[PDB]
Structures are given as structure tokens and as C-alpha cells.
Amino acid sequence: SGFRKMAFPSGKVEGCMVQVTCGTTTLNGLWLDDVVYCPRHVICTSEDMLNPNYEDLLIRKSNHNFLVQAGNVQLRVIGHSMQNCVLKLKVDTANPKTPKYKFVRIQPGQTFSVLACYNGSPSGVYQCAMRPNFTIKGSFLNGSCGSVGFNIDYDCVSFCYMHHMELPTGVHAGTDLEGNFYGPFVDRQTAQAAGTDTTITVNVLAWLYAAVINGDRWFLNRFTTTLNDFNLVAMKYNYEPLTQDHVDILGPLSAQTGIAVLDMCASLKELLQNGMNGRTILGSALLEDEFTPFDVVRQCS
Amino acid sequence: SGFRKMAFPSGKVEGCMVQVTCGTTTLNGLWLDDVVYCPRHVICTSEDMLNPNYEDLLIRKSNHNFLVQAGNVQLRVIGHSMQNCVLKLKVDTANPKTPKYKFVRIQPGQTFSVLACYNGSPSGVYQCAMRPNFTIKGSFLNGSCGSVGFNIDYDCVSFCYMHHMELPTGVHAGTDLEGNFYGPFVDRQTAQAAGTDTTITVNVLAWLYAAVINGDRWFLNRFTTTLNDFNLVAMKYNYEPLTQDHVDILGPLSAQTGIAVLDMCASLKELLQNGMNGRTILGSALLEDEFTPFDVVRQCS
Ligand SMILES: *[C@](O)(C(=O)NC1CC1)[C@H](CCCC)NC(=O)[C@@H]1[C@@H]2[C@H](CN1C(=O)[C@@H](NC(=O)NC1(CS(=O)(=O)C(C)(C)C)CCCCC1)C(C)(C)C)C2(C)C
Numbered sequence: 001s002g003f004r005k006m007a008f009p010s011g012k013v014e015g016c017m018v019q020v021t022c023g024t025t026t027l028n029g030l031w032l033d034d035v036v037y038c039p040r041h042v043i044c045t046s047e048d049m050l051n052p053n054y055e056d057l058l059i060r061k062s063n064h065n066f067l068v069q070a071g072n073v074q075l076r077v078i079g080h081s082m083q084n085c086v087l088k089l090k091v092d093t094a095n096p097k098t099p100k101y102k103f104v105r106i107q108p109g110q111t112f113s114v115l116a117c118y119n120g121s122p123s124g125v126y127q128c129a130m131r132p133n134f135t136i137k138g139s140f141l142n143g144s145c146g147s148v149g150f151n152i153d154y155d156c157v158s159f160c161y162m163h164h165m166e167l168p169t170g171v172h173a174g175t176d177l178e179g180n181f182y183g184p185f186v187d188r189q190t191a192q193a194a195g196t197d198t199t200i201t202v203n204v205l206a207w208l209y210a211a212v213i214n215g216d217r218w219f220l221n222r223f224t225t226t227l228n229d230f231n232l233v234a235m236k237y238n239y240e241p242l243t244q245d246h247v248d249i250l251g252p253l254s255a256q257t258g259i260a261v262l263d264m265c266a267s268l269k270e271l272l273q274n275g276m277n278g279r280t281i282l283g284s285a286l287l288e289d290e291f292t293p294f295d296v297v298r299q300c301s
Numbered sequence: 302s303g304f305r306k307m308a309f310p311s312g313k314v315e316g317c318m319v320q321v322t323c324g325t326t327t328l329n330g331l332w333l334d335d336v337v338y339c340p341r342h343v344i345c346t347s348e349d350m351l352n353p354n355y356e357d358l359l360i361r362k363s364n365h366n367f368l369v370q371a372g373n374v375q376l377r378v379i380g381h382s383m384q385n386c387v388l389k390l391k392v393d394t395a396n397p398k399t400p401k402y403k404f405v406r407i408q409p410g411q412t413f414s415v416l417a418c419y420n421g422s423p424s425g426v427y428q429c430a431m432r433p434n435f436t437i438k439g440s441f442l443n444g445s446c447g448s449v450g451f452n453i454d455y456d457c458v459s460f461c462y463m464h465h466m467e468l469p470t471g472v473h474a475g476t477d478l479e480g481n482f483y484g485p486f487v488d489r490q491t492a493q494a495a496g497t498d499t500t501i502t503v504n505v506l507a508w509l510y511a512a513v514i515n516g517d518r519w520f521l522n523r524f525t526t527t528l529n530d531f532n533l534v535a536m537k538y539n540y541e542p543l544t545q546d547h548v549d550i551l552g553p554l555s556a557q558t559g560i561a562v563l564d565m566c567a568s569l570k571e572l573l574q575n576g577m578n579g580r581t582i583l584g585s586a587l588l589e590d591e592f593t594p595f596d597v598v599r600q601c602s
């Protein structure tokens with residue numbers, strides 16, 4: 001037993017991470033088939049970042065201005081193009097370690113694994129969640145842009161995220177693998193507000209079920225609630241509203257524990273109104289909302 | 302920036318995880334060169350677990366009683382032997398994905414990455430620490446025995462742990478890759494007490510430096526302490542004693558922040574005596590002790 005924040009095995013993704021250097025900037029790229037994907041602001045100087053015309057900047061770039069490197073292998077760029085915010089660098093060599101993959105755009109509240117890399121070399125792996133305000137709380141230093149987020153579906157690598165920027169809060173923002181940013185953000189160095197962040201309610205309940213599965217039951221109360229009355233408490237504490245879909249998703253967790261979703265919501269109502277009173281849940285003194293119901297079921301079966 | 306619990310890339314280890322089935326038991330094995338390493342109690346029935354004579358049990362086993370499987374490949378066992386608590390199954394095929402590796406026995410307080418597997422297939426990756434009482438807090442279901450812990454040193458995979466058992470506490474215990482158990486534990490299903498667990502003090506200080514690097518400074522006080530006076534507070538709260546070696550190890554973190562180790566210990570003294578008063582440090586309402594000074598420096602450079 002035991003419950004830990006767990007990331008997918010990164011082996012299939014490590015063989016796709018390359019180094020991309022354009023002039024003075026070095027970051028990471030994703031090498032699938034014969035294209036290297038990377039954030040388009042690799043072509044920007046520190047001055048260009050303030051107000052870039054990416055179409056004009058890319059025009060002044062030739063193929064030889066991009067030094068792509070996969071370990072010791074050096075990949076020829078035979079062309080370059082732009083897909084909304086990502087630079088697609090066509091190379092003369094197909095990646096022999098290219099896995100079976102898809103490009104997916106995940107929903108707020110869903111989780112994924114990030115393979116943090118620096119100068120094209122993988123550094124570490126950790127699990128993240130797409131916050132309701134379309135940011136993520138990760139660990140990205142200078143040189144980590146281009147690192148990708150992914151899920152492993154059956155026998156398929158589903159790329160969902162590529163890191164671009166850091167927020168004044170300390171949270172991070174990026175795009176899908178088609179270059180479309182998650183959230184209202186644009187790749188320009190200017191003031192941009194992230195939305196008020198809320199707590200993923202269905203994730204908290206899935207995490208409370210994980211605690212019940214692992215023996216932690218002190219928060220279970222013998223009261224129940226309604227979807228309306230709970231959602232009144234939820235919006236007071238900036239918890240995102242619970243729907244009947246969320247109840248159905250938690251079905252496998254409620255069936256395993258024999259505790260209905262509306263029963264668990266009464267326990268969560270008490271925890272929000274009274275706090276934890278000095279106790280812990282799964283070794284945490286705070287409510288955790290970065291485990292999807294799938295993540296919990298994945299770690300219990 | 303940002304600070305997250307991070308595990309090493311698992312690609313080099315995934316290509317070594319195989320399935321080991323002996324009679325009715327299925328668990329994981331480690332396929333290096335031409336040997337498969339796995340916990341020796343794979344040969345035990347549920348009845349043998351209570352009081353096993355592993356020498357007598359292994360004698361009744363032939364080579365054909367071990368079904369080893371690497372995905373679809375089926376590996377011939379051409380011999381079997383015992384190295385203290387691990388079964389070494391010699392196979393007729395050398396693993397072509399064998400990386401450069403060593404077998405190391407880590408110290409209490411050090412961390413490593415666990416590649417959790419089930420039926421020989423990798424499931425997830427997460428970071429763990431060898432507690433002072435030689436247990437670990439991981440996520441191991443039925444079928445996870447045989448999963449290994451490892452560090453990646455420069456260009457070398459240092460295997461340090463193989464999972465064997467679960468404790469009544471919910472914590473886990475295992476051996477090094479030479480079959481020697483961490484802690485006083487034996488591979489027998491009988492009452493065995495783990496030692497009183499203590500908090501890794503040098504790890505807490507490294508985690509407090511990480512918070513200072515990432516902007517969290519509310520706990521810094523303008524007092525300092527001595528190594529003696531702090532160790533008096535440390536033993537009261539079951540914190541393991543701080544030595545001059547621990548001070549020297551934190552050198553890179555104290556130099557980056559300009560905050561001496563004895564200064565940070567006065568902040569930790571206040572946090573233990575007064576609690577957190579409702580605030581958080583790096584998004585946690587509890588003191589974290591599973592980040593080594595190396596882990597923090599690794600995530601900041
Ligand atoms: C990344 O490309 C990288 O790893 N580069 C390698 C070469 C070193 C790099 C990583 C930076 C954080 C470690 N990313 C960037 O350089 C991006 C691109 C330029 C600016 N940043 C960036 O991360 C900015 N953040 C930023 O500008 N964020 C905002 C504006 S803001 O922070 O509110 C402020 C007004 C500037 C204070 C704009 C984007 C949306 C969020 C807010 C920092 C370098 C300041 C962290 C691009 C094009 C965004």
C-alpha cells in the first residue's frame with residue numbers, strides 16, 4: 001500500500017529530448033520523426049522579448065542559425081516553420097527512438113508528468129496538474145524551456161504540455177504541442193495576470209478516498225449533504241463546483257470504500273470550516289488537489 | 302524556479318525490469334547482463350512465509366520452476382543461486398539494454414528514486430528517502446516486490462534498494478542489490494519492530510534553504526544558536542543530532558543565500574517550539590525532511 005505522488009516512466013520521452021541553440025539562447029526541443037519542436041522565443045534576444053514580431057524575427061533566420069544536438073549526434077535543420085508559438089525545425093534524420101505518440105490538449109484539473117531537462121539532457125521527472133487558471137506549479141530553471149508534459153495511455157505517449165514561461169507568482173505556463181497557450185497568456189515579456197486560482201474539488205475527494213483506502217479515516221463524519229448545499233460552501237472557499245459528472249467519475253472510489261460521494265462531501269465541508277485541528281491526512285496538514293480520480297485508482301489497482 | 306520532489310529519469314532502469322513467476326507467486330526482477338535479481342521469497346507459498354527455511358525450499362526448486370519474462374521475450378534460466386536474501390537467476394540471454402551500473406548501499410538520510418513495477422511492467426516513478434530507522438515511505442501494492450531504487454551518478458546507474466515487505470505502520474523495507482536488508486528486518490512473516498523514527502535534521506535545513514532561494518523567508522529570525530544548544534532542542538522533538546559535517550555539507554546552500562547554518566538552526570528551533578502558526582513553507586504546512594542538500598543544490602543549479 002502507501003500513496004505517493006507518482007510520475008509516469010520517462011524512458012520513451014528521454015530518447016526524444018534534444019538541445020536547441022539559436023544564437024545566444026539554449027533550451028530544449030522535442031525530436032519526433034524528423035521535426036524538432038521548441039518554443040518559438042528561442043530566436044529572440046533579451047531585447048526582442050519585450051515586444052517581439054515573431055514573423056519578422058523568424059524571417060531574418062536561416063537554417064544554419066539553429067544548432068540542434070542530441071547528445072553527440074548533430075541534426076541538420078533542412079527547414080523551419082512556426083505553429084502558433086512553437087518552432088518546427090525539420091531535420092534530415094528521423095529519430096530512431098520515436099515512440100508511438102499523440103498530441104492532446106488536456107483539461108483544467110487533469111494531471112501529467114513533466115520530464116524536466118536542461119541543455120537537452122533530462123534532469124528529473126515529477127507529476128503536475130493543470131490548474132483551473134491554466135498554470136502549473138513545477139520546477140523550471142533557466143534552460144528548462146522546451147521540457148514537455150505527457151501521459152502514457154495504454155501503449156501511447158500523449159504529449160500535452162511544453163514549458164515556455166514563469167509567472168510572477170512562481171507558477172509556470174506553456175502551450176500544447178500545437179503551439180496554443182494554456183490560458184490567456186502570450187509569449188511576450190509584459191504584465192499578464194493569471195486568473196484567481198481555485199481548488200480542484202473532485203481531486204480533493206479522490207485524495208480523501210485514497211486516505212480512507214490507506215487507513216486514514218478520522219475525518220469521516222456521520223453526516224451527508226446535497227450537491228447544492230455543498231457547492232455553497234465550495235464557492236466560499238474558492239473550491240470549483242461539483243457536478244453529477246464528478247460524482248459518476250468517483251464511482252470506482254466510492255464503490256471500493258462503500259462511502260458515497262455526498263457523504264465524503266460532508267467530511268470535506270467540515271474540514272474546510274474547522275480546519276484539520278493539528279492532524280494530518282496521508283502525511284499532509286493541507287488538503288491536496290493534484291490527484292485525479294484516475295491517479296488514485298491507478299495507484300490502488 | 303520552483304521546488305518539487307523530483308525523481309531521476311527512469312529510462313535506463315525500465316529496460317531491465319522483468320517478470321518473475323515461481324509457482325503461484327508473481328513479482329518483479331532486475332535483469333542485468335545475464336542475471337535476474339529478485340527477492341528470494343518468490344519461492345515461498347503463503348504457508349512458507351511464516352517460518353521459511355530458504356535453503357530447503359530452494360533445493361526443491363529446479364530451473365523450470367522459474368518463468369522469467371521481459372515483455373514478450375522469454376528468458377531461459379540456466380541456473381539459480383541465493384545471495385543472502387535475493388535470488389540470482391542466471392539466464393541464457395544477456396540483456397542488450399544493460400546500462401553502466403554499480404551496486405551501492407546507501408546511508409540513512411540519503412534519497413533515491415523508485416521505479417514501481419507490477420508484473421514486470423513499470424508503473425511509475427517517485428523519490429524516497431532511507432529513514433533513520435531504515436524504512437521508506439513509498440507506494441507498493443501486491444506485485445510491486447522486486448522494484449528497485451536507484452541513483453544516477455554522472456553516467457552510472459547506482460542501484461541501492463530492492464523492495465521486499467510492508468511494515469504494520471504502512472512503511473516499507475527491503476535490501477540492497479547484494480541481498481542485505483536495511484534495518485534489523487528478516488524476510489519472515491512474524492512480528493518485527495522498526496526503530497523509533499527520527500527527523501533528518503540536515504535535510505530539513507536544506508529544505509529551508511530551498512524555501513529561502515524560492516522567496517519564502519517569513520521563518521528567518523534574527524537570532525542564532527550553537528551546535529550544542531540546538532541539539533538539545535533536536536532530541537526533544539526526535540530530531541537526529543547536527544554535526545560539523547552536516548554544517549560543511551550545507552556550505553553551498555549557506556553560501557548562495559548568505560545565511561549561516563547556525564542562523565538557520567535558530568529559525569528551525571522557533572518552528573519546532575512554536576509551530577507554523579497557520580502559514581506554509583514551499584506549499585507545505587509541515588517540515589519536510591526528504592530532500593538532501595544534494596537534492597536541493599541539484600534543483601537550484
Ligand atoms: C526559457 O525559455 C528558458 O529556459 N530559457 C533558457 C535560456 C535560459 C525561459 C525561462 C525563464 C524562467 C526560468 N523563458 C523565458 O525567457 C520567457 C520568455 C520571455 C520571458 N520569459 C519568462 O519566463 C519571464 N516571465 C514573464 O515575462 N512572464 C510574464 C510577465 S511578468 O512576469 O508578469 C513581468 C511583467 C515580466 C514581471 C509574461 C508571460 C506570461 C506570464 C507573465 C521571466 C524571465 C521574467 C521569468 C517570454 C517570451 C515569455
Ligand SMILES: *[C@](O)(C(=O)NC1CC1)[C@H](CCCC)NC(=O)[C@@H]1[C@@H]2[C@H](CN1C(=O)[C@@H](NC(=O)NC1(CS(=O)(=O)C(C)(C)C)CCCCC1)C(C)(C)C)C2(C)C
Nearest residue numbers: 342442443444445446465466467469488489490491492493
Ligand atoms: C511482495 O513479495 C509482492 O509484491 N508479492 C506479489 C505476489 C503479490 C509482497 C508484498 C506485500 C505487500 C503488498 N511481500 C511479501 O509478501 C512479504 C514477504 C512475506 C510477508 N510480506 C509482507 O510484505 C507482509 N509484511 C510482514 O510480514 N511484515 C513484518 C511482520 S508484521 O507486518 O509486523 C505482522 C506481524 C505480520 C503483522 C515482517 C517483515 C518485517 C516487517 C514486519 C505483509 C503481506 C503482511 C504486508 C515476507 C517474507 C516478509
